[PDB]
């Protein structure tokens, strides 16, 4: 469900992002 609004949010710390129960977390840079 639009985890396209999430992929920037773990860039906040290390990473990029995908795609948790519906609110998402990291990929590498």
Swiss-Prot record:
Location of this chain's protein in the cell: Secreted
Keywords: Disulfide bond, Ion channel impairing toxin, Neurotoxin, Potassium channel impairing toxin, Secreted, Signal, Toxin, Voltage-gated potassium channel impairing toxin
GO CC terms, sorted: extracellular region
Disulfide-bond pairs as recorded: 3-19, 6-24, 10-26
UniProt note on tissues of expression: Expressed by the venom gland.
Gene Ontology MF: a single term: toxin activity
Domain notes: Has the structural arrangement of an alpha-helix connected to a beta-sheet by disulfide bonds (CSalpha/beta).
UniProt record similarity statement: Belongs to the short scorpion toxin superfamily. Potassium channel inhibitor family. Alpha-KTx 08 subfamily.
Summary of the function given for this chain in its UniProt record: This toxin inhibits rKv1.1/KCNA1 (100% inhibition at 3 uM), Kv1.3/KCNA3 (human, mouse and rat) (IC(50)=269-467 nM), shaker IR (60% at 3 uM) and activates the mouse capsaicin receptor TRPV1 (EC(50)=132 uM, at 20 degrees Celsius), a non-selective cation channel expressed by sensory neurons of the pain pathway. In vivo, intraplantar injection of this toxin in WT mice hind paw shows significant acute pain, whereas no pain is observed when the toxin is injected into TRPV1 KO mice.
Note: Negative results: does not block mKv1.1/KCNA1. Does not inhibit rKv1.2/KCNA2, rKv1.4/KCNA4, rKv1.5/KCNA5, rKv1.6/KCNA6, rKv11.1/KCNH2/ERG1. Shows a very weak inhibition of Kv7.1/KCNQ1 channels (4% at 10 uM).
Protein known as: Potassium channel toxin alpha-KTx 8.2
Organism, as annotated: Olivierus martensii (Manchurian scorpion)
Residues of the full protein shown: 29 to 57 of 57
